[PDB]
Design a protein around this ligand. Structure first.
Ligand code: HEM
Ligand code: HEM
Lengths: 144, 144
């Protein structure tokens, strides 16, 4: 699991990121859709591409609860169902992580040291691992 | 969360405990029912008291997966339903922990150093916290 200084950075910095949420969210989606065209179809409705505006902010909310992730399971389970419906794969998670971290770097500016960015990368990984595992079991559940 | 040496002890020792599973299970229940009469009603059927023989071994299985606890969620969810049905409370978990650790001490004998017992206490706490949180949400779900 995560070490203590990692958690401290997360707990210490997540309120900063939340305060600049609109920049995180919009930079995230701008870069996600531009740099990774292959994921655009999963967001295609039906007529502009959908941007589930709570995606990045929900990562931040999970990070707030990083020491008690079971507490967010009712939300995770509901999101997992939409993910499995949409076709989200474990291999997508590093792409979302990359663009989330790019958004975080933009917001933190000067305060964006390597250790703080590394901490957020580690935290995202742990959060992503929860969804991946829950969706893996949902996918397996579907062909019973 | 847990530190690395804790996890090492758990990963290193859980196979030892599994090998002596029958002693863990039977010492656990003997001491649980003798020292904590108030929990006997939750195990009362209907005609001897039920001993869900997999209780302690399931803690050990969770401990095996201590770095990916989401993986055991399908099992946890099913057990949580039985717990909420039976009337299991968050305040029961320290009692089960105490008698589990007593059983572990018995099996490890000489190898039962304070650091190894402390590690198992910490690990049980994290495992217990998962069930507690899942059952808390199930209890709340019931009065919607
Ligand atoms: C920890 C990582 C992630 C979190 C916290 C997260 C969170 C969310 C949230 C809150 C929603 C809106 C759910 C709703 O209210 O219905 C959503 C939807 C969606 N997410 Fe994720 N997400 C994550 C990772 C990903 C990844 C890796 C992909 C891969 C492309 C992805 C693709 C989608 C898509 C396509 C939707 C729309 C579902 C629909 O419209 O039916 N997400 N996500
Ligand atoms: C991490 C801690 C625990 C684990 C891993 C665990 C595991 C289990 C398992 C595997 C079963 C059998 C489920 C089945 O196959 O139907 C069970 C049943 C049961 N457990 Fe737990 N348990 C834990 C904590 C507790 C606590 C704290 C209590 C408090 C008294 C408790 C009381 C019971 C009772 C009364 C049953 C019987 C349910 C029934 O017969 O309907 N357990 N537990």
């Amino acid at each position: 699991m995560l070490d203590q200084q990692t958690i401290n950075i997360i707990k210490a910095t997540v309120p900063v990121l939340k305060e600049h949420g609109v920049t995180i969210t919009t930079t995230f989606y701008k870069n996600l859709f531009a740099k990774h065209p292959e994921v655009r179809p999963l967001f295609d409705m039906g007529e502009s591409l959908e941007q589930p505006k709570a995606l990045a902010m929900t990562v931040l909310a999970a990070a707030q609860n990083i020491e008690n992730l079971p507490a967010i399971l009712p939300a995770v389970k509901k999101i997992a169902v939409k993910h499995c419906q949409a076709g989200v794969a474990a291999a997508h998670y590093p792409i979302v992580g990359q663009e989330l971290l790019g958004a975080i770097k933009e917001v933190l500016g000067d305060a964006a040291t390597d250790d703080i960015l590394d901490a957020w990368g580690k935290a995202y990984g742990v959060i992503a691992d929860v969804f991946i595992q829950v969706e893996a079991d949902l996918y397996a559940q579907a062909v019973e």
